Design a protein around this nucleic acid. Structure first.
Ligand SMILES: Nc1nc2c(ncn2[C@H]2C[C@H](O)[C@@H](COP(=O)(O)NP(=O)(O)OP(=O)(O)O)O2)c(=O)[nH]1
Ligand SMILES: [Mg+2]
Ligand SMILES: [Mn+2]
Ligand SMILES: [Mn+2]
Length: 539
DNA sequence: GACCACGCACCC
DNA sequence: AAACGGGTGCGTGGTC
């Protein structure tokens, strides 16, 4: 390309180099743009940001986030990553997309700008005639990248003093647990080393081994194995408690307070838009989509996520979303009727599991029932089911039969989906998002059936992801107009922040947007709560 | 310091 | 652990 002076004309493709991957923390080392056979390199990248009207190119959102961090409203535009991701969601990295569609991902901004321009041309050509993928690009993914940029740059408030104090309390309990484990073992060892623990449990204490690990075939010490040995030896209970506390302390309590951004005073995640095989987002650096919630200590951690003073959090979560999506995709008349009647399949399974009235189903029971319902739907074996519920094999097998017999068009839809995936090589969501699953014709049954479970899961999970993304795109401008903020997405959940005086109106509006985003054969219902912290906002 | 593979625990 | 699916992060153990 012909080198030309900064600035570029409108519409040019940008390239940029960051000191580190996280745009809220990165130094902008270099900036360039490409257009019309020319490449323009910025003499000083920070000041040069002011000259761009739009971030157009590879990883556009990340540059937008850094721009917003610097007080500049630079929206992301076209991004070849999003085109490639829609053609094939195994396209997750700029390294791979470049090699696949016509260039090389280097560490030079000018080359990244030229690469962005070339890949856009080629990928746009590949999408010619792919009208449904183009709709997803123009109506979902490209607009969503601007929404995600704002979310990332906004961040969430965290009670750091609370977590610092909690760390000290948990440390004293961990010491109690580890001392007791070492006493029971008859000697100390590194309780964090599962290789050392394996020897203690199965060689020294002679406990029965229950299962093997996947890659190396060691005797497993995982929670599922420990729970089966709960009554074999008192050390097991102490190990399980140690495992929970150290996981929670090492992954959430201790690291998160150290990640508060000095300019914003908030915690900033990344919402990765080309990272999953189904069209879901992921979250990283830190992941704010796996914050604890199930146990009492996990709930204490979730309470650390708080609203700004004068504001409230609003949490919205789709009811039984993938079961509702399944009703629409399969067209099963009975399952459609279940939700037209306002029934709750998780609560109903929980009532049966624990043998108590629906009135008596607490959140832990419903959570356990959720796992059973989706486990069974997506191919859980009768053997594992019998083991999960502590019930005879014949009973577990009968539960599965009753599950599917109730909704006969589901199995028909599954077999239709698999046959189509075999013939086409890909399955697709309601909106046409594709996942390629070539192993559907593998000659090794274990490999083939694993591919099958991946394949017929994707239209369900992926359609739910499409709906959530579309809802975010529609909701974001409404929140801006109301002075409210979108903070987090957790797959079928949004966490908003609203001024106290408008929180009720925001909750009502967001619920209506989410419920009416794209009507299905079944109503979409959204549970909504308001509170000063994330846990209290989920009722 | 970095990378990785792995087992394991976090959530939807 | 197992014929549920989709993810990320930590510590260990090994390596460079
Ligand atoms: N295959 C699979 N999918 C899962 C699992 N857990 C969650 N998902 C998928 C399927 C879920 O539909 C979706 C959202 O998870 P929730 O919001 O925690 N549960 P839901 O929306 O069903 O019920 P409600 O909100 O009324 O309590 O994520 C699981 O164990 N397995
Ligand atoms: Mg204390
Ligand atoms: Mn839900
Ligand atoms: Mn949810």
């Amino acid at each position: 390309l012909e080198e030309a002076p900064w600035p570029p004309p409108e519409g040019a493709f940008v390239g940029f180099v960051l000191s580190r991957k996280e745009p809220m923390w990165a130094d902008l080392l270099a900036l360039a743009a490409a257009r019309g056979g020319r490449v323009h390199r910025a003499p000083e990248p920070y000041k040069a940001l002011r000259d761009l009207k739009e971030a157009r190119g590879l990883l556009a959102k990340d540059l937008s986030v850094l721009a917003l961090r610097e007080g500049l409203g630079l929206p992301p535009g076209d991004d070849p990553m999003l085109l490639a991701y829609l053609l094939d969601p195994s396209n997750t990295t700029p390294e791979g997309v470049a090699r696949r569609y016509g260039g090389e991902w280097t560490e030079e901004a000018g080359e990244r700008a030229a690469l962005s321009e070339r890949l856009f041309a080629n990928l746009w050509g590949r999408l010619e005639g792919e009208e449904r993928l183009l709709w997803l690009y123009r109506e979902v993914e490209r607009p969503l990248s601007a929404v995600l940029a704002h979310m990332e740059a906004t961040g969430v408030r965290l009670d750091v003093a609370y977590l610092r104090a909690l760390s000290l309390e948990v440390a004293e309990e961990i010491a109690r647990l580890e001392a007791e484990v070492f006493r029971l073992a008859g000697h100390p060892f590194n309780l964090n080393s599962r290789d050392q623990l394996e020897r203690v449990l199965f060689d020294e204490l002679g406990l029965p081994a229950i299962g093997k690990t996947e890659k190396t075939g060691k005797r497993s010490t995982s929670a599922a194995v420990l729970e089966a040995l709960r009554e074999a030896h008192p050390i097991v209970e102490k190990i399980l408690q140690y495992r929970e506390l150290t996981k929670l302390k090492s992954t959430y309590i201790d690291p998160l307070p150290d990640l508060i951004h000095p300019r914003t005073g908030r915690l900033h995640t990344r919402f990765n838009q080309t990272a999953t095989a189904t069209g879901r987002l992921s979250s990283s650096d830190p992941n704010l989509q796996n914050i604890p919630v199930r146990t009492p200590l996990g709930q204490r951690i979730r309470r650390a996520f708080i609203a700004e003073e004068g504001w409230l959090l609003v949490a919205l979560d789709y009811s039984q979303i993938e079961l509702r999506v399944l009703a629409h995709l399969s067209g099963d008349e009975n399952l459609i009727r279940v939700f037209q009647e306002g029934r709750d399949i998780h609560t109903e399974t929980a009532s049966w599991m624990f043998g108590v009235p629906r009135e008596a189903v607490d959140p832990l029971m419903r959570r356990a029932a959720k796992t059973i319902n989706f486990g069974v739907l997506y191919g859980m074996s009768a053997h594992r089911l019998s083991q999960e519920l502590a019930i005879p094999y014949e009973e577990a097998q009968a539960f599965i039969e009753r599950y599917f017999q109730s909704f006969p068009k589901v199995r028909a839809w599954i077999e239709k989906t698999l046959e189509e995936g075999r013939r086409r090589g890909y399955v697709e969501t309601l909106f046409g998002r594709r996942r390629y699953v070539p192993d559907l014709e593998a000659r090794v049954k274990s490999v083939r059936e694993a591919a099958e479970r991946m394949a017929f899961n994707m239209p369900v999970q992926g359609t739910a992801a499409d709906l959530m993304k579309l809802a975010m795109v529609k909701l974001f401008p409404r929140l801006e107009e109301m002075g409210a903020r979108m903070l987090l997405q957790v797959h079928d959940e949004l966490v908003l922040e609203a001024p106290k005086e408008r929180a009720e109106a925001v909750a009502r509006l967001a619920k209506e947007v989410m419920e009416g985003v794209y009507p299905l054969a079944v109503p979409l219902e959204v549970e909504v709560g308001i509170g000063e912290d994330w846990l209290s906002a989920k009722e």
